Design a protein around this nucleic acid. Sequence first.
RNA 1: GCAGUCAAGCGUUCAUAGCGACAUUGCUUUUUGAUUCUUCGAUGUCGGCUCUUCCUAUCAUACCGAAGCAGAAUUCGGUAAGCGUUGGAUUGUUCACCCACUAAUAGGGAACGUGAGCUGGGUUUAGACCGUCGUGAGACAGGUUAGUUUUACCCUACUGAU
RNA 2: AGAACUGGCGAUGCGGGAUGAACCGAACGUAGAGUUAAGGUGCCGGAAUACACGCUCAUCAGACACCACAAAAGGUGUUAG
Lengths: 50, 133, 188
Amino acid sequence: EPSLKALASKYNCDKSVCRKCYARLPPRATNCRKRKCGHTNQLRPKKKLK
Amino acid sequence: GAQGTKFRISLGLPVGAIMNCADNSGARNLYIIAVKGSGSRLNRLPAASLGDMVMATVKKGKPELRKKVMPAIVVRQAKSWRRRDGVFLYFEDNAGVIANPKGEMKGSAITGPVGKECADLWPRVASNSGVVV
Amino acid sequence: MKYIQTEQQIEVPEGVTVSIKSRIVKVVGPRGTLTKNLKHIDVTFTKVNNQLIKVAVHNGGRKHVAALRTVKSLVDNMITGVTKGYKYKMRYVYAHFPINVNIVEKDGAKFIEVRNFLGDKKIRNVPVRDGVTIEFSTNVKDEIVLSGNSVEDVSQNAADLQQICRVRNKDIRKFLDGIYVSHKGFIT
RNA sequence: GCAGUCAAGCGUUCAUAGCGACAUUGCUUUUUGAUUCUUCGAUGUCGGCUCUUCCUAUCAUACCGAAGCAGAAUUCGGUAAGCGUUGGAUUGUUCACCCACUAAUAGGGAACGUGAGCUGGGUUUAGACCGUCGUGAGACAGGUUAGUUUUACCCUACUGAU
RNA sequence: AGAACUGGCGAUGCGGGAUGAACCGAACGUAGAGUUAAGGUGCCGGAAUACACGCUCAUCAGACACCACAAAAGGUGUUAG
Ligand SMILES: [Mg+2]
Ligand SMILES: [Mg+2]
Ligand SMILES: [Mg+2]
Ligand SMILES: [Mg+2]
Ligand SMILES: [Mg+2]
Ligand SMILES: [Mg+2]
Ligand SMILES: [Mg+2]
Ligand SMILES: [Mg+2]
Ligand SMILES: [Mg+2]
Ligand SMILES: [Mg+2]
Ligand SMILES: [Mg+2]
Ligand SMILES: [Mg+2]
Ligand SMILES: [Mg+2]
Ligand SMILES: [Zn+2]
């Protein structure tokens, strides 16, 4: 089911991760929204499943 | 590997108690060092009742069964306890049988009566038991 | 830097009438009526004609001006909500256990139930907000459609259905099972 | 003792899932030193027992984020001290070390909490023994054995009662 | 812990720093009136909830020398360059 799998991927897989507080972020985000890390710009992509 | 639950029974065998060996494994007595599933409270000794699984060491018997820790199951209790039908009952002595962690008996025969609570909880004990209560 | 004057424009169709007084906005259209309370922004509405309405901020900073464009978007959404409406489509995604979704009535409250999510015995209930109608589309397998006049009511109702089907204690990249919004559009 | 910054490298490929050299910035007063301000017309000195409360740098339990998270198991991180954190062999022990149960057997403070609350095994009066040292009297942060633990009726605090 | 020059405390009250041997102001017979120092003028508290141009919103804001603490490193928070 490639069409349905892609639909569920954009909500569960296509995300960014803050390197300081592990927050789940939009893929195109430049800064983290959390105040605990001071809105840091150090972000990494969310690792894909294998 | 208990096959169900058990309504609470009065405890009469704290750590350090010695009970007779009710099977034909070659052991003569069992020395209780721990009780499975016991709670924690400062200064309170872990205690066991009928149908409980304990960790025990053989003090008298075949030398191959001595100087080691093995599980055991209590099958008779001298301390009186009340059943849910309103009966207070007790046995003449305290006795147990050597078993593995899964509940299988090391021996193959049981001498003397066996409590009903123990037989229902452990199917292997019930198979090798002659008279229940 | 305290800009002297910032201005935005709001367009009104032929069949829509707008009444604004004391930051209370009521929009009446062919599909119904909507009302919004905006007494937290300090803006000034002015009427140019029957087809144009302007909203302005005087001597406003960067943060205050940023809220002026938000007012225009909220009012515009109300205008199209009573003219075209909003239609949100969602799809059921599962690997092994089928998902059964049905509408039930509980003390006259119009709930919607989700059954057999990952084989769970628990029943999940989601309230249906007023003004939101739920239908199950034909000739498309495992699709639920939400419609209404208020975009916020439709969007939040759909969002509640999505969050109620989140997987716990599992790898979400592997267990891609749930109900997800797949299309946002207008009823017309 | 605890926590950051930088990132050469480790991680099959891939600096930062999890780690991280060469350097560098801090925090803590549960280590030990440095100092000698308070007390020598005396603030009872080790540990355990008993009992209350507090801190969070969270072992377990509730809800979550991340992974080199398929499942199971585990690892890193967040909000959180609400609620728990034990039974034994040897040792005076703090500490340490094993046995075992357990959801878990987390770390600390309160005059290194707590002797008109106890106990007195240890240290640290006088008796005595041994080894080394000293001509000797005697010495030893070396070992060994025996050695009195006093008072509340006052004020306050607290618990109950008029 | 130990030296150099000066000013102090000790031997010293008084106004100010909430509180303090050493800081700030000022040194003292008994009284009256006037004016000030350092420090202050929302209320406690005597005295402008005075005037003027800006900056700052903090789910642990900040608030005055000695003085009763905070750093490296960061933020598309906001402001100016
Ligand atoms: Mg000195
Ligand atoms: Mg005293
Ligand atoms: Mg005394
Ligand atoms: Mg003490
Ligand atoms: Mg005493
Ligand atoms: Mg005392
Ligand atoms: Mg006393
Ligand atoms: Mg003694
Ligand atoms: Mg002596
Ligand atoms: Mg005595
Ligand atoms: Mg003198
Ligand atoms: Mg002060
Ligand atoms: Mg006044
Ligand atoms: Zn972050």
